[PDB]
Amino acid sequence: TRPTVRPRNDVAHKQLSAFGEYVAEILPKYVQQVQVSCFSELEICIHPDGVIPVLTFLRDHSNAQFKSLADLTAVDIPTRQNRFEIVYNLLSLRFNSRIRVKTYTDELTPVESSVSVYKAANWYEREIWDMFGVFFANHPDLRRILTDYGFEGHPFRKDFPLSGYVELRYDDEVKRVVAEPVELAQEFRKFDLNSPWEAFPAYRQPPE
Amino acid sequence: SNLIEVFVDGQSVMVEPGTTVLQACEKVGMQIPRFCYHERLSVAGNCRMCLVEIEKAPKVVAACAMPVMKGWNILTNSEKTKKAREGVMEFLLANHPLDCPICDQGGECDLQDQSMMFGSDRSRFLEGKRAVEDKNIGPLVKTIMTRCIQCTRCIRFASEIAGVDDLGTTGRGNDMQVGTYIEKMFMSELSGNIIDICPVGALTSKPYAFTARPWETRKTESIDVMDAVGSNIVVSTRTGEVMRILPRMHEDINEEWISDKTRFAYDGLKRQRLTEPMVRNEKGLLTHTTWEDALSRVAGMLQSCQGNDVAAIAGGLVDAEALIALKDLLNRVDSDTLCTEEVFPTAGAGTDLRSNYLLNTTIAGVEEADVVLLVGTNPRFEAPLFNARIRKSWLHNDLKVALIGSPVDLTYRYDHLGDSPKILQDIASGSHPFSQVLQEAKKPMVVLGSSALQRNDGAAILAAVSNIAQKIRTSSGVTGDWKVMNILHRIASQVAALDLGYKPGVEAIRKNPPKMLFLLGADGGCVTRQDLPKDCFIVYQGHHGDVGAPIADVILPGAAYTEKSATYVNTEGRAQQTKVAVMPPGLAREDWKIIRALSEIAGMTLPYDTLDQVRNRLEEVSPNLVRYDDVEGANYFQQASELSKLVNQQLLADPLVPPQLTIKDFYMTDSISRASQTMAKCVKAVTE
Amino acid sequence: GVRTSPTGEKVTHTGQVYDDEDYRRVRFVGRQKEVNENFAIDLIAEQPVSQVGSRVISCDGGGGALGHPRVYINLDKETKTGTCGYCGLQFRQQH
Amino acid sequence: TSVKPIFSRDMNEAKRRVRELYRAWYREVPNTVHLFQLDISVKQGRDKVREMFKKNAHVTDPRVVDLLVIKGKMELEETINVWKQRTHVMRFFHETEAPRPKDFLSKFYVGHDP
Amino acid sequence: PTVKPPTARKFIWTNHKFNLSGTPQQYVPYSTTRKKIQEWVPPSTPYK
Amino acid sequence: LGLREIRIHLCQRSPGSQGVRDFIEKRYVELKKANPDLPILIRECSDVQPKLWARYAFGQEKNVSLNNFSADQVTRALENVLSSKA
Amino acid sequence: TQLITVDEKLDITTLTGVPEEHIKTRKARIFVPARNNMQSGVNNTKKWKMEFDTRERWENPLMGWASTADPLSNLVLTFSTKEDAIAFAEKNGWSYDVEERKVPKPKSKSYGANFSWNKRTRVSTK
Numbered sequence A: 001t002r003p004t005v006r007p008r009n010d011v012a013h014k015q016l017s018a019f020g021e022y023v024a025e026i027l028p029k030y031v032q033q034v035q036v037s038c039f040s041e042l043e044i045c046i047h048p049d050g051v052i053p054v055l056t057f058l059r060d061h062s063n064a065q066f067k068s069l070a071d072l073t074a075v076d077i078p079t080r081q082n083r084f085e086i087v088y089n090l091l092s093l094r095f096n097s098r099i100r101v102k103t104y105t106d107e108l109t110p111v112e113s114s115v116s117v118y119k120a121a122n123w124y125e126r127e128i129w130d131m132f133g134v135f136f137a138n139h140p141d142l143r144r145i146l147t148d149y150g151f152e153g154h155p156f157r158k159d160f161p162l163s164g165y166v167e168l169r170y171d172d173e174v175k176r177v178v179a180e181p182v183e184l185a186q187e188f189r190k191f192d193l194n195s196p197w198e199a200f201p202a203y204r205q206p207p208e
Numbered sequence B: 001s002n003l004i005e006v007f008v009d010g011q012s013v014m015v016e017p018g019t020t021v022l023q024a025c026e027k028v029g030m031q032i033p034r035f036c037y038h039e040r041l042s043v044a045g046n047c048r049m050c051l052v053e054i055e056k057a058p059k060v061v062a063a064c065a066m067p068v069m070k071g072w073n074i075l076t077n078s079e080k081t082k083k084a085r086e087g088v089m090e091f092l093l094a095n096h097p098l099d100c101p102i103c104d105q106g107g108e109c110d111l112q113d114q115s116m117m118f119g120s121d122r123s124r125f126l127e128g129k130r131a132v133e134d135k136n137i138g139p140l141v142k143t144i145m146t147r148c149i150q151c152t153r154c155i156r157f158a159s160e161i162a163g164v165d166d167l168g169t170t171g172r173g174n175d176m177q178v179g180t181y182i183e184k185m186f187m188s189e190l191s192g193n194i195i196d197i198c199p200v201g202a203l204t205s206k207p208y209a210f211t212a213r214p215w216e217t218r219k220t221e222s223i224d225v226m227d228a229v230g231s232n233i234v235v236s237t238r239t240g241e242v243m244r245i246l247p248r249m250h251e252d253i254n255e256e257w258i259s260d261k262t263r264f265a266y267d268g269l270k271r272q273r274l275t276e277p278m279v280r281n282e283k284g285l286l287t288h289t290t291w292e293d294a295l296s297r298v299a300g301m302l303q304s305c306q307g308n309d310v311a312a313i314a315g316g317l318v319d320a321e322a323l324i325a326l327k328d329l330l331n332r333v334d335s336d337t338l339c340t341e342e343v344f345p346t347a348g349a350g351t352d353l354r355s356n357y358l359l360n361t362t363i364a365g366v367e368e369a370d371v372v373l374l375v376g377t378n379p380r381f382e383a384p385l386f387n388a389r390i391r392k393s394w395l396h397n398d399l400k401v402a403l404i405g406s407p408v409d410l411t412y413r414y415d416h417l418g419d420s421p422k423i424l425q426d427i428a429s430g431s432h433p434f435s436q437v438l439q440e441a442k443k444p445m446v447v448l449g450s451s452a453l454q455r456n457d458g459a460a461i462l463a464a465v466s467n468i469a470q471k472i473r474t475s476s477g478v479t480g481d482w483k484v485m486n487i488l489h490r491i492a493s494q495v496a497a498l499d500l501g502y503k504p505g506v507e508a509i510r511k512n513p514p515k516m517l518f519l520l521g522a523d524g525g526c527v528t529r530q531d532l533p534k535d536c537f538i539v540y541q542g543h544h545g546d547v548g549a550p551i552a553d554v555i556l557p558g559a560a561y562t563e564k565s566a567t568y569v570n571t572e573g574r575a576q577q578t579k580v581a582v583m584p585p586g587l588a589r590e591d592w593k594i595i596r597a598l599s600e601i602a603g604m605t606l607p608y609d610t611l612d613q614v615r616n617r618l619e620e621v622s623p624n625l626v627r628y629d630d631v632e633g634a635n636y637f638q639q640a641s642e643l644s645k646l647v648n649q650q651l652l653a654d655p656l657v658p659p660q661l662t663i664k665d666f667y668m669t670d671s672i673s674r675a676s677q678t679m680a681k682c683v684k685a686v687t688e
Numbered sequence C: 001g002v003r004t005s006p007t008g009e010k011v012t013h014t015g016q017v018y019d020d021e022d023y024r025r026v027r028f029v030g031r032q033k034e035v036n037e038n039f040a041i042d043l044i045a046e047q048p049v050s051q052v053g054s055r056v057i058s059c060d061g062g063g064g065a066l067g068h069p070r071v072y073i074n075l076d077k078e079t080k081t082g083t084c085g086y087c088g089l090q091f092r093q094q095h
Numbered sequence D: 001t002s003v004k005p006i007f008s009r010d011m012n013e014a015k016r017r018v019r020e021l022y023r024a025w026y027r028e029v030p031n032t033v034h035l036f037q038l039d040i041s042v043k044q045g046r047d048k049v050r051e052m053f054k055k056n057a058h059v060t061d062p063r064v065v066d067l068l069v070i071k072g073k074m075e076l077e078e079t080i081n082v083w084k085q086r087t088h089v090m091r092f093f094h095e096t097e098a099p100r101p102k103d104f105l106s107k108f109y110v111g112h113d114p
Numbered sequence E: 001p002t003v004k005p006p007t008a009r010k011f012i013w014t015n016h017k018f019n020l021s022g023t024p025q026q027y028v029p030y031s032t033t034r035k036k037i038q039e040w041v042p043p044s045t046p047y048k
Numbered sequence F: 001l002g003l004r005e006i007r008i009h010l011c012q013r014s015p016g017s018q019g020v021r022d023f024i025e026k027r028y029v030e031l032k033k034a035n036p037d038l039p040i041l042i043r044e045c046s047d048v049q050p051k052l053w054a055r056y057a058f059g060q061e062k063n064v065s066l067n068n069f070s071a072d073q074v075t076r077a078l079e080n081v082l083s084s085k086a
Numbered sequence G: 001t002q003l004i005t006v007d008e009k010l011d012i013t014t015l016t017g018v019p020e021e022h023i024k025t026r027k028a029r030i031f032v033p034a035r036n037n038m039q040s041g042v043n044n045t046k047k048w049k050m051e052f053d054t055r056e057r058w059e060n061p062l063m064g065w066a067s068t069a070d071p072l073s074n075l076v077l078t079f080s081t082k083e084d085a086i087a088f089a090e091k092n093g094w095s096y097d098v099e100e101r102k103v104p105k106p107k108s109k110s111y112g113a114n115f116s117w118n119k120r121t122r123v124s125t126k
Ligand code: SF4
Pocket: B096, B097, B098, B099, B100, B103, B104, B105, B106, B107, B109, B110, B111, B112, B147, B199, B200, B201, B202
């Protein structure tokens, strides 16, 4: 398994497991799950009410010092009743490490904003509200950031179609750019590329 | 309990005795690769792909044929199981041709898929491959035997299910080939299933050849309407054009097979279509016109008619929604002359009770029977999958089959009692040995064909068969939940029409002819312009111009079964719905929408606007038409027996002859099949 | 081997030609309809059949890695030649 | 069944927020008409505002109508400042769009759409 | 090509043509497929 | 104007349809003997309510609920339907 | 109390931005997809899928491509269980129909049945 297989890191896996135990034991009020992946990445899944305390602890603790917020993302998984999974990626320059903090919310429940901890969260969760419709309570200035000014609907949700519901064209009668119901000269062709055979037995789900 | 305990990857599972290693691994969600094993075929065990390792045992076993004993641990992902899989895949791909871009199995090939999943990634073969001479087995199946892997599903299917025994293996060693050894056409009613079960591209569909690729086809699950079995199919389209038809899986109807007419009628579905409303001009020729003109002319002629001056005939490919729309429209003008082309006797109980015009047991209830009597029908061609079920029960359950009628070929051995109805009279009188056999039967089953009821003495035949059924069911050892009387239908629209209250047969029209006739796809030619009065206004509504369209005055283009969501009832009373695959071509519309618009123009608007309100009205007329994929029971056999004993119709001397005696008569039945070039090729192949 | 129509329109090698009453011929008015004058079905018909003395033959299209994947053709039938599925070249056994 | 509120605990404060948003839109409609040089009158703009509020008036969940008030507030702030152009303001009025038939007969005449 | 001439093939153009955009010899797109659905031609004789 | 058809919907196993079942099994033969040209469509269903539809001329329709009835009650209802003709 | 009580049905149709005629006139279908009969693998029949009815596709006048006006033509959603799909369809205001999952019933497989002494299940060849 030498030339064509990715070498495995075990010291980092042990250190990340120990730090996951450390965090999940310091904060039992919000932490629900702690896992470490195959490629040595630590994910801490927490309750949505403890977004501010967990992030402030990870930012300010002497043994954490996660001073950088790299990326803030939402993921749309429609089969869950809390379909939106909000993911914080943090970087610690003191210990040269990275962590992942995950929480959940649905369409109608707001999430506490983390601008008071990290200042990149302003534009990041403004984009999250724009694309997934997740409201962030106690935000300084929450509006749209990437979509059109009159756009209706959140495009990164999975029930939103690839091509939207409206399209723009210039009309000479009103001398203006107008929005009309979408009609495609060629329909986007859907491809069924999924193999009917199981690829990875290690990820096999148990039957009902 | 008799269950034993085995372990799959250390996980305990209780299995029945006689279970194989493959089924035990399937019980926990692990699918061992196969190339020759099929769950509906006998076990051959020659591909050796399923070689799994049992722990504490220095030999891999074939999981498709090895039974499990207690305490066994199966290692589905161990090192030597993977080594065996890689070796067998290498041997399978050693002599395979490099034909993947030019072969129709690409993208849906089992060999490609479990070579990518379980095999190696490169080839050590430094020799030359073999080449096999291609064969000709008919205009339906394209044969390229260089791609064959000698899995022998061909012979097992053709011998155990189709019952033909024409395919075989000739040769020895690497020169062994699969074929018929002579220039013989493997022409059966179940030939395309050998295309379905071939794991490689060795057998392919000739009409489908070189047309599409499997990843780009959109799949729509629908119901076949080509016969009254009610087979579930998947229509695969591509950019709004119907490409091919595959079977769906339904364990109680058509388990994974379909007939050849179902598989190859689509090329006629895309020919000879009606795409625009037509009216007669002043020279008497059908010219194109708009929807408004044709609807206004039909409504204006309908407004002057009242009573028995307007009638309607229903064809063989008509949905329940159009039937109830036409019934409501004609009832708004106070007319009850709604007829079907297929004749059913109304003497006695008639179409009131559902027990005397249904396949009362089940399609899947033939597995539980022990003695089956078929009267005056050829089930091989009227309902091929019903005959497949009878053959399966004959093979595995050791069924006893006897037939009254012409000695046709049924792909199993039966007892030909004769072809006279006096034998039916003699069975109920106890003067026959088969009467004693029926009395000794624990689960008897008497099947009467719909084609035997088309005769002038059909009511007497039905009365005699029901007399036999009620003599057996009341007296002999039948519990009461077992239904003996059965009727096999051959028209997809017949049961839905009989449930909604249509009068079977066109005798009502022939009694008092109307001055305005509606034809809903009635292409059987039962009523022509000679029977009708001198100036009759005939309105035809359908998708194909075959028989009724030249004699019509207004032609209203309808939709086919692949172009609308529709409700169809099969011969056992089960209701099913067909989804929309494509849209009707040109100016053609949905049938009930046409009838509703015609009602709106005439000022007699029906109280439904969308499809769901039409189905609500359908539930109002009969509640079993809106419960899909459910079979409802039908009691009150004694009441129908008591009612049928009143009028004593005299039996005739004519022998019971089915209309479909050979394979030649099977292909061309209705307007869809008659417009198919593939059916013409099949008829030309079987006649030469 | 191009062919013309009663309209005066050239017919492509796939058999396409616009109808006489079709309105879509207006796109070629003042312009031209582009067709390929080299019909591959007529061009591959001029290649002579190759006679070989073996039961099977191998075809790669010529050029090795610059051709099609190598296939093997059986020559057991005497009534017909063996056509390659990729390049369309046909072969005949000498005996 | 207990859920976390957004702004309104029950329906009364939500109705107050709807009332305030309608008052703000009704006040701003003349300035929006004047500043954007629209071809409509003030009455047509106020009728469009009332039409949107009436279209959106069948909801009984406090959180849903809180989100609706929030999105309306974003639209109002988007219009008070000159961030929308004339096309974004006029996109509420479908002038170039063809009139869609509604009865059964015309839909039957024009196509297969139910 | 005075030193290493290209391979001669029978289908290669013997006359090179420049960009014909905006000319009467410009390329006009069209569909190369035939008709999919065949219509029913009514009979030319009266029903009498 | 006049009656055209009668529809009797019922369930095979529900106790609310037991009166309709008893009425069918005891009196349907003589009912059909009395009215040979009248379509009396008996339709079973898995969980439907007992119902009695009656269609008249020009599409007029009437509905009677037979829920939790006895044989005599549905017999009197059928006599009323046969004698009404309106 | 920071937790209010809402006893109404969950409905989010006023927030999704979908036009109303793509809500009230569309029929969602919830089903487990059938196994492709050309293959013996069953990995594609594990998850529930919700899709929509097929609308009109016509031919482009220029190139003959397939043109459509239905934005929901390629919308296929995946759900782990049936109730999640039902709740998602009911939350979004789509009228839906549900088809039950069809599983293959177990068979009785015996290699020794091919060589029976007196039964019809003998194989004529092998
Ligand atoms: S049968 Fe399968 S492996 Fe063989 S050429 Fe066809 S796609 Fe390739």
